[PDB]
Amino acid sequence: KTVRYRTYEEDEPGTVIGTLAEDLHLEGEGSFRLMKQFNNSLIHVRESDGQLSIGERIDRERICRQSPHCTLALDVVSVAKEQFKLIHVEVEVRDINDNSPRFPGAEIPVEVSESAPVGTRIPLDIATDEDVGVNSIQSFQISENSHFSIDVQTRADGVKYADLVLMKELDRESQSAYTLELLAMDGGSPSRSGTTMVNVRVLDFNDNSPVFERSSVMVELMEDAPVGHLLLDLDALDPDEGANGEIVYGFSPQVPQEVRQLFKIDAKSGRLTLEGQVDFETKQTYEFDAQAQDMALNPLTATCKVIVRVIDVNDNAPVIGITPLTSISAGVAYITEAAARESFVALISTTDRDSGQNGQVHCTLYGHEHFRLQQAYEDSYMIVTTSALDREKIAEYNLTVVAEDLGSPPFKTVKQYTIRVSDENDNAPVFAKPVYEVSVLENNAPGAYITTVVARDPDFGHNGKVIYRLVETEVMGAPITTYVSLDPATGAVYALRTFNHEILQQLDLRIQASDGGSPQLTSSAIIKVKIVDQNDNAPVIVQPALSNGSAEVVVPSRAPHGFLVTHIKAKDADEGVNAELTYSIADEGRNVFTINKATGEVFLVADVSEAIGQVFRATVSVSDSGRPPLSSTATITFLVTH
Amino acid sequence: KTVRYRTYEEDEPGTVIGTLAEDLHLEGEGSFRLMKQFNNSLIHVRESDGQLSIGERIDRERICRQSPHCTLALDVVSVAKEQFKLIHVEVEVRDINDNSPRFPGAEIPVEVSESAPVGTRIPLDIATDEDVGVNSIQSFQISENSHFSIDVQTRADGVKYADLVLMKELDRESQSAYTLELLAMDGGSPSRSGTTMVNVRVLDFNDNSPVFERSSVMVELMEDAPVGHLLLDLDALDPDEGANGEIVYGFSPQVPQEVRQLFKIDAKSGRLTLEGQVDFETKQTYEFDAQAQDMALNPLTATCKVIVRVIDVNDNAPVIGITPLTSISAGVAYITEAAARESFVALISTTDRDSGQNGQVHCTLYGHEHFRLQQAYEDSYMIVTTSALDREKIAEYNLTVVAEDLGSPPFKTVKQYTIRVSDENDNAPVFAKPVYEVSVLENNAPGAYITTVVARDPDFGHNGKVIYRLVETEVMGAPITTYVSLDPATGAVYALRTFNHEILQQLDLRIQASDGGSPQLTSSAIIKVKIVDQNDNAPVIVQPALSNGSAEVVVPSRAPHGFLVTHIKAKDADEGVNAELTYSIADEGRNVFTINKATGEVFLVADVSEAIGQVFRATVSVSDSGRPPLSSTATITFLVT
Ligand SMILES: *[C@@H]1O[C@H](CO[C@@H]2O[C@@H](C)[C@@H](O)[C@@H](O)[C@@H]2O)[C@@H](O[C@@H]2O[C@H](CO)[C@@H](O[C@@H]3O[C@H](CO)[C@@H](O)[C@H](O)[C@@H]3O)[C@H](O)[C@H]2NC(C)=O)[C@H](O)[C@H]1NC(C)=O
Ligand SMILES: *[C@@H]1O[C@H](CO[C@@H]2O[C@@H](C)[C@@H](O)[C@@H](O)[C@@H]2O)[C@@H](O[C@@H]2O[C@H](CO)[C@@H](O[C@@H]3O[C@H](CO)[C@@H](O)[C@H](O)[C@@H]3O)[C@H](O)[C@H]2NC(C)=O)[C@H](O)[C@H]1NC(C)=O
Ligand SMILES: *[C@H]1O[C@H](CO)[C@@H](O)[C@H](O)[C@@H]1O
Ligand SMILES: *[C@H]1O[C@H](CO)[C@@H](O)[C@H](O)[C@@H]1O
Ligand SMILES: *[C@H]1O[C@H](CO)[C@@H](O)[C@H](O)[C@@H]1O
Ligand SMILES: *[C@H]1O[C@H](CO)[C@@H](O)[C@H](O)[C@@H]1O
Ligand SMILES: [Ca+2]
Ligand SMILES: [Ca+2]
Ligand SMILES: [Ca+2]
Ligand SMILES: [Ca+2]
Ligand SMILES: [Ca+2]
Ligand SMILES: [Ca+2]
Ligand SMILES: [Ca+2]
Ligand SMILES: [Ca+2]
Ligand SMILES: [Ca+2]
Ligand SMILES: [Ca+2]
Ligand SMILES: [Ca+2]
Ligand SMILES: [Ca+2]
Ligand SMILES: [Ca+2]
Ligand SMILES: [Ca+2]
Ligand SMILES: [Ca+2]
Ligand SMILES: [Ca+2]
Ligand SMILES: [Ca+2]
Ligand SMILES: [Ca+2]
Ligand SMILES: [Ca+2]
Ligand SMILES: [Ca+2]
Ligand SMILES: [Ca+2]
Ligand SMILES: [Ca+2]
Ligand SMILES: [Ca+2]
Ligand SMILES: [Ca+2]
Ligand SMILES: [Ca+2]
Ligand SMILES: [Ca+2]
Ligand SMILES: [Ca+2]
Ligand SMILES: [Ca+2]
Ligand SMILES: [Ca+2]
Ligand SMILES: [Ca+2]
Ligand SMILES: [Cl-]
Ligand SMILES: [Cl-]
Ligand code: NA
Ligand code: NA
């Protein structure tokens, strides 16, 4: 039969569970023993009457571990009136709360990503309480915090594990670790707690792109900055951890290739440097996005707008260009001597590629005062005449143009230029004097030389070649061209005929000088050729009438001394000295007749000597004054009559 | 001086810009000419009046490209009254919209991660309009969508570039591509359009862990399921692309080594198989988290709660254990023959480790009807006595216990057991006969043997060895211990004295037989020794009185034959035959007297011849029957007066 008692674990040995003999009204005898003791039993039985007392130590957690019931079963045998009996006894061992919740370790380290969704579960080491029932772990508490809570769950074989659950989204940059106190406690007003620490390690996600310390940057860069010049040390920052926050600098992928060759970005430090050479006169502003990138699985990027303003340097000098209105030779401007005052000759351009004062030009002209500088428009100055030009006075000019910029120091450019004045037919031939006077002795040879005329045209080339022409004029009906000829190149006048003074005294040539111009220019002069007389006409006796060189006149013997017989008149063709007639009645032996040398009047020296019938011959000559003189003779006879 | 006109690009050649002679009130002359004719000039001037017309085509976009202003400069020279003059002229060339916005290429390919925050800018190929001012690129057109909204920004050098900007979070699993044709038109009333293709390709991020078609699953596993048995084909899914969505199955990191050695998960297919062996009697429920993992750089994981409930099979047979109250040998129970009805002898345990009917046991006992089975508690049956036991009748019993479980089919276990009955001193010695009788011849030697007695004790060991003792009783005053002795071991009786029948006829010995037990048991018997006579008593003659064998008697002579003279009496000490008196009348010569052998009376044969004075001599003897017979002698004389 089954008799049942109840004990309480870890009681002092020798406590009264019960007594069989008395509990079951057992009158008779008893030799109460346990039937077998393979291990040293925990309960002792009084042989006298079957009293069951706590023998050794009774630890429920050692004999039943986590089993909800713990019954110690023993078989006692007795003897009553020579009958051996058996009684089966079951002693329920009640549980005492002599064990407290325990955790494996004082700290539980756990890891979770900041990118995990709310509700993600994180395992925790289970607590254990070696008691059973209410004396086992009933409740769990977590320390007050914002993010984490616990939930307890039981497995199908009854093992009661715990989970840490995430309530709010994490951010490792705000908070990267958590320290939470975890505790478990059992039932019954005598309550026992056990504790541990949860160390939550928040693992980083790359949820932050880099960002530059400054969103945009401008830097100034001299256009003569040397290679390696440091423009700027770019800086960025990333809050993420380790590689996710480690930055590498460079260009935005859209930056053209010119910039990538001109400028360089150190990928580690962000230094931005010049590797090429810039030129303000070509491009004065660069605009590009630099970028920063973190070294993460899914990299994040940020950009910074960089502006480089290039600054101008005086690296250009003035350029002088000269373009003439009219010219043939290089670097020579031509202009007609006919150009009026303030005529444009050539245009000067003075330019400077730079900007500001460095590109501003002052132009100055050096040369004869006949030319002036006149500004036409920006950096464009005209050369203009200030006075009338005269090729015959000045045929060319050498000029000098200087152009300086306003840099400090300034660049100076110098250039030379030549002006040549074009000929117009501005001057006509000019005879030394308008009227020339020359003389020619009568009875010349034919083809004799009289004179030469000269006219002058100072114009050059064909416009200044003189041509001489005999103007056609009449001379005693006939034309001038028959008496005289003129070499049209030299202007030499040659006589074609032999001239006779007795006929023609003066010959008036009219010569024209012409240039080889278009229109032709002419001028006239006159040569007054003088023919002067000579002694080629001997005088002739007119009265008395001549008969083969002889004559006769009679004389009355009735007449006085110094008689008026006859009057010898004579004529000469020449002029002046050569027409000075002097008379002589001479060589007669006896002095018979006497002559008046003035008016050729012949008188008698002797008295009336004979009566009648006398013949007397003498000679009477007429001469002129010129050298050599010529003369003619008349032989006249006189007779005495009554 | 600078005189200013204005024209419009690509106008009809020969069109009138203006007239210098008339515009500048130029009275006088003019032989208007250009100074520069080294390249083929695009403007020609009429000599008469200085009016210049468009010679060739004038294309602003080719002489000034993208330059805001386009002024052609020309230097003309005239001659007025022999004076050469110069006039500088600036002809503004105005732009018309004979050029349309355009994009460098027919397609713009673009890639963006679905994980990019709002506001991320994607650069786009810049548009170009070769006109200037309002005729330049003024407007950018965007396609209506929820995620991409673009923004136009202007640079230091005035070009209007456009950025593709994202305002709302993308999801490549929701939407993975976009195709947007990008075009722009310029300002001013006649607008010209130009276009390209934008192909937005969304790149995948590993933003979705795998998840199982079922969060938990339970499977039943027979405890005799063979190695390789298929428990379950795990299935999991991942929306992500390529390797980010390709799964490998295995155990959660917390799974003990017992489970990892016992069960196996194929990483590729997720098949869960038994490689070891389970035993319901050892562990009947397994619980573990299987997990699936995507093959991504930093993979994402999911778990599935797997329950394996083990099923019981009848793989254990009942075990029989027997524990006796009292025992010496292995597998042998002892019990005293003194036990009463229904005394506990031994406890049988019949158990089966299985569960259900497979573990439920029926116990049956086979053997002598003196023992039966009585259940004490669960799987615990008592062997009990049913009747009184007697070691002397049955000392040992061979029993058999049978224990079957209730499986289908059932397991049966048999066991043998032996019970031995312990001896108690329940029996006392008992003699063959209660009263023994033997005889002894008189006059025996001293120290002679009479008989031997034997008693019987069936009890065992000391409880059955008999010792005999002579009970102290008196015989004619003295104690019996003096006539006889008893050997306590053999039971032999030796005669101590020599016995005389005349005195002692019957000797009543009282023997006790006792066993060697505690308490000691005794029983008594009696030996009646009878003493029988012998002939060691010679008889003597009493009447008449004797004198060394002689006597004398007188008688008167007056009588005939047969007279009463004298009467010869004798006595014998023995009994029976040896006390048989025989009378003899011995020789006297003459036939004088004759004797009656019955009553010892002697008479006379001859008459009275003599009166007085005669002496007569004879002998008369008495004898007994025994062998040898004994006799004494007496001589009697008779005389007359
Ligand atoms: C204007 O300038 C011309 C150009 O000549 C010069 O060339 C350079 C070397 C520099 O000196 C410049 O400053 C200058 O422009 C002058 O022409 C030169 O004239 C001289 C003298 O008349 C010539 O030399 C002569 O040669 C002949 C024959 O060999 C000799 O008989 C003379 O005795 C004399 O040495 C020279 O050839 C000529 N140069 C050229 C290139 O033609 C010119 O004098 C000047 N005009 C004025 C008005 O100043
Ligand atoms: C109770 O059991 C004992 C011993 O246990 C027995 O051992 C074997 C026989 C097993 O097969 C078991 O089945 C069995 O329980 C029995 O004792 C045996 O008795 C036999 C009786 O014939 C003996 O054999 C005889 O022995 C004599 C003298 O030695 C010979 O002259 C005969 O020719 C014959 O062989 C045997 O020796 C004996 N053995 C032992 C170990 O004791 C016993 O019989 C049994 N009791 C009952 C009532 O069945
Ligand atoms: C166990 O102990 C804790 C303190 O460690 C208590 O707060 C709890 O209520 C239980 O008694
Ligand atoms: C659990 O354990 C902690 C530290 O071990 C204690 O501070 C707490 O009161 C509880 O007993
Ligand atoms: C080209 O087309 C666009 C619209 O498609 C207009 O903005 C433009 O004016 C031109 O017609
Ligand atoms: C610009 O060009 C596209 C083709 O690339 C046209 O489809 C569009 O209408 C616009 O004219
Ligand atoms: Ca305890
Ligand atoms: Ca406890
Ligand atoms: Ca507890
Ligand atoms: Ca963060
Ligand atoms: Ca982060
Ligand atoms: Ca980052
Ligand atoms: Ca430069
Ligand atoms: Ca410069
Ligand atoms: Ca300069
Ligand atoms: Ca002149
Ligand atoms: Ca001239
Ligand atoms: Ca001239
Ligand atoms: Ca002459
Ligand atoms: Ca003359
Ligand atoms: Ca003369
Ligand atoms: Ca155009
Ligand atoms: Ca245009
Ligand atoms: Ca346009
Ligand atoms: Ca997605
Ligand atoms: Ca995805
Ligand atoms: Ca995935
Ligand atoms: Ca099993
Ligand atoms: Ca089983
Ligand atoms: Ca079974
Ligand atoms: Ca008995
Ligand atoms: Ca006995
Ligand atoms: Ca006995
Ligand atoms: Ca005797
Ligand atoms: Ca006798
Ligand atoms: Ca006798
Ligand atoms: Cl003459
Ligand atoms: Cl005797
Ligand atoms: Na830096
Ligand atoms: Na599968």
mmCIF file of all heavy atoms in Angstrom, chain A residues 93-109:
data_model
loop_
_atom_site.group_PDB
_atom_site.id
_atom_site.type_symbol
_atom_site.label_atom_id
_atom_site.label_comp_id
_atom_site.label_asym_id
_atom_site.label_seq_id
_atom_site.Cartn_x
_atom_site.Cartn_y
_atom_site.Cartn_z
ATOM 1 N N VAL A 93 9.094 15.879 -1.507
ATOM 2 C CA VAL A 93 10.119 16.821 -1.073
ATOM 3 C C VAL A 93 9.711 18.200 -1.579
ATOM 4 O O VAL A 93 9.790 18.479 -2.781
ATOM 5 C CB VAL A 93 11.512 16.431 -1.584
ATOM 6 C CG1 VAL A 93 12.521 17.510 -1.232
ATOM 7 C CG2 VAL A 93 11.929 15.089 -1.017
ATOM 8 N N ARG A 94 9.281 19.070 -0.668
ATOM 9 C CA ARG A 94 8.865 20.414 -1.045
ATOM 10 C C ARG A 94 10.090 21.284 -1.315
ATOM 11 O O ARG A 94 11.144 21.126 -0.691
ATOM 12 C CB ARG A 94 7.998 21.049 0.049
ATOM 13 C CG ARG A 94 6.677 20.335 0.351
ATOM 14 C CD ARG A 94 5.714 20.281 -0.835
ATOM 15 N NE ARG A 94 5.282 21.596 -1.311
ATOM 16 C CZ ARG A 94 4.301 22.316 -0.769
ATOM 17 N NH1 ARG A 94 3.640 21.865 0.291
ATOM 18 N NH2 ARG A 94 3.988 23.498 -1.287
ATOM 19 N N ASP A 95 9.939 22.215 -2.253
ATOM 20 C CA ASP A 95 11.048 23.049 -2.694
ATOM 21 C C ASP A 95 11.173 24.289 -1.821
ATOM 22 O O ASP A 95 10.171 24.900 -1.439
ATOM 23 C CB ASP A 95 10.858 23.460 -4.156
ATOM 24 C CG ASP A 95 11.947 24.404 -4.651
ATOM 25 O OD1 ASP A 95 12.942 24.627 -3.926
ATOM 26 O OD2 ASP A 95 11.808 24.930 -5.776
ATOM 27 N N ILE A 96 12.417 24.647 -1.505
ATOM 28 C CA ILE A 96 12.739 25.871 -0.784
ATOM 29 C C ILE A 96 13.493 26.787 -1.732
ATOM 30 O O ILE A 96 14.140 26.334 -2.678
ATOM 31 C CB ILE A 96 13.559 25.565 0.486
ATOM 32 C CG1 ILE A 96 13.369 26.678 1.521
ATOM 33 C CG2 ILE A 96 15.031 25.402 0.168
ATOM 34 C CD1 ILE A 96 11.959 26.776 2.081
ATOM 35 N N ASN A 97 13.394 28.088 -1.477
ATOM 36 C CA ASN A 97 13.948 29.109 -2.364
ATOM 37 C C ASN A 97 15.391 29.453 -2.002
ATOM 38 O O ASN A 97 15.757 30.610 -1.808
ATOM 39 C CB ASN A 97 13.060 30.344 -2.316
ATOM 40 C CG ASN A 97 13.365 31.326 -3.428
ATOM 41 O OD1 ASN A 97 13.824 30.942 -4.505
ATOM 42 N ND2 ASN A 97 13.127 32.606 -3.166
ATOM 43 N N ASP A 98 16.220 28.418 -1.909
ATOM 44 C CA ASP A 98 17.621 28.565 -1.545
ATOM 45 C C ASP A 98 18.521 28.760 -2.751
ATOM 46 O O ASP A 98 19.738 28.577 -2.641
ATOM 47 C CB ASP A 98 18.087 27.350 -0.737
ATOM 48 C CG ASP A 98 17.735 26.022 -1.398
ATOM 49 O OD1 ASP A 98 17.066 26.016 -2.457
ATOM 50 O OD2 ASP A 98 18.119 24.975 -0.835
ATOM 51 N N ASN A 99 17.956 29.131 -3.895
ATOM 52 C CA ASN A 99 18.746 29.434 -5.075
ATOM 53 C C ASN A 99 18.186 30.674 -5.748
ATOM 54 O O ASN A 99 16.965 30.806 -5.908
ATOM 55 C CB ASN A 99 18.769 28.267 -6.060
ATOM 56 C CG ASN A 99 19.753 27.187 -5.652
ATOM 57 O OD1 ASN A 99 20.956 27.427 -5.558
ATOM 58 N ND2 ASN A 99 19.243 25.994 -5.391
ATOM 59 N N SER A 100 19.098 31.562 -6.160
ATOM 60 C CA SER A 100 18.767 32.822 -6.754
ATOM 61 C C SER A 100 19.088 32.811 -8.234
ATOM 62 O O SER A 100 19.992 32.092 -8.674
ATOM 63 C CB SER A 100 19.569 33.920 -6.068
ATOM 64 O OG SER A 100 20.915 33.493 -5.883
ATOM 65 N N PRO A 101 18.391 33.625 -9.022
ATOM 66 C CA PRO A 101 18.706 33.697 -10.455
ATOM 67 C C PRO A 101 20.162 34.074 -10.679
ATOM 68 O O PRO A 101 20.719 34.918 -9.977
ATOM 69 C CB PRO A 101 17.755 34.777 -10.984
ATOM 70 C CG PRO A 101 16.609 34.772 -10.010
ATOM 71 C CD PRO A 101 17.228 34.458 -8.655
ATOM 72 N N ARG A 102 20.775 33.441 -11.676
ATOM 73 C CA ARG A 102 22.174 33.658 -12.002
ATOM 74 C C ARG A 102 22.313 33.826 -13.508
ATOM 75 O O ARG A 102 21.563 33.237 -14.290
ATOM 76 C CB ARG A 102 23.058 32.489 -11.508
ATOM 77 C CG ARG A 102 23.166 32.388 -9.989
ATOM 78 C CD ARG A 102 24.119 31.259 -9.529
ATOM 79 N NE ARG A 102 25.524 31.540 -9.830
ATOM 80 C CZ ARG A 102 26.253 30.870 -10.720
ATOM 81 N NH1 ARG A 102 25.724 29.857 -11.401
ATOM 82 N NH2 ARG A 102 27.518 31.214 -10.927
ATOM 83 N N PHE A 103 23.262 34.661 -13.899
ATOM 84 C CA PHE A 103 23.640 34.834 -15.288
ATOM 85 C C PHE A 103 25.016 34.218 -15.526
ATOM 86 O O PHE A 103 25.872 34.241 -14.634
ATOM 87 C CB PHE A 103 23.684 36.312 -15.691
ATOM 88 C CG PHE A 103 22.330 36.952 -15.826
ATOM 89 C CD1 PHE A 103 21.749 37.610 -14.756
ATOM 90 C CD2 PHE A 103 21.649 36.910 -17.031
ATOM 91 C CE1 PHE A 103 20.509 38.204 -14.886
ATOM 92 C CE2 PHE A 103 20.412 37.500 -17.169
ATOM 93 C CZ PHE A 103 19.837 38.147 -16.097
ATOM 94 N N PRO A 104 25.269 33.643 -16.704
ATOM 95 C CA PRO A 104 26.613 33.079 -16.947
ATOM 96 C C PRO A 104 27.731 34.061 -16.638
ATOM 97 O O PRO A 104 28.700 33.719 -15.946
ATOM 98 C CB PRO A 104 26.583 32.717 -18.440
ATOM 99 C CG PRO A 104 25.146 32.557 -18.775
ATOM 100 C CD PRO A 104 24.379 33.502 -17.871
ATOM 101 N N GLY A 105 27.613 35.288 -17.142
ATOM 102 C CA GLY A 105 28.657 36.272 -16.990
ATOM 103 C C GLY A 105 28.099 37.596 -16.506
ATOM 104 O O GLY A 105 26.915 37.902 -16.665
ATOM 105 N N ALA A 106 28.989 38.385 -15.900
ATOM 106 C CA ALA A 106 28.607 39.677 -15.343
ATOM 107 C C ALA A 106 28.347 40.715 -16.423
ATOM 108 O O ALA A 106 27.748 41.758 -16.139
ATOM 109 C CB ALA A 106 29.701 40.176 -14.390
ATOM 110 N N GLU A 107 28.807 40.460 -17.641
ATOM 111 C CA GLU A 107 28.629 41.360 -18.765
ATOM 112 C C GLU A 107 28.295 40.508 -19.980
ATOM 113 O O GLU A 107 28.876 39.435 -20.177
ATOM 114 C CB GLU A 107 29.885 42.209 -19.003
ATOM 115 C CG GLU A 107 30.224 43.139 -17.833
ATOM 116 C CD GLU A 107 31.486 43.974 -18.064
ATOM 117 O OE1 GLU A 107 32.292 43.620 -18.956
ATOM 118 O OE2 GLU A 107 31.673 44.984 -17.345
ATOM 119 N N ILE A 108 27.337 40.975 -20.772
ATOM 120 C CA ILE A 108 26.947 40.319 -22.016
ATOM 121 C C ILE A 108 27.258 41.287 -23.149
ATOM 122 O O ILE A 108 26.572 42.313 -23.289
ATOM 123 C CB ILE A 108 25.463 39.926 -22.001
ATOM 124 C CG1 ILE A 108 25.203 38.925 -20.876
ATOM 125 C CG2 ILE A 108 25.044 39.333 -23.333
ATOM 126 C CD1 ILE A 108 23.738 38.590 -20.679
ATOM 127 N N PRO A 109 28.285 41.025 -23.963
ATOM 128 C CA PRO A 109 28.567 41.927 -25.089
ATOM 129 C C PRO A 109 27.764 41.534 -26.316
ATOM 130 O O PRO A 109 27.755 40.360 -26.697
ATOM 131 C CB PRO A 109 30.073 41.753 -25.303
ATOM 132 C CG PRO A 109 30.302 40.309 -24.938
ATOM 133 C CD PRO A 109 29.294 39.950 -23.846
#
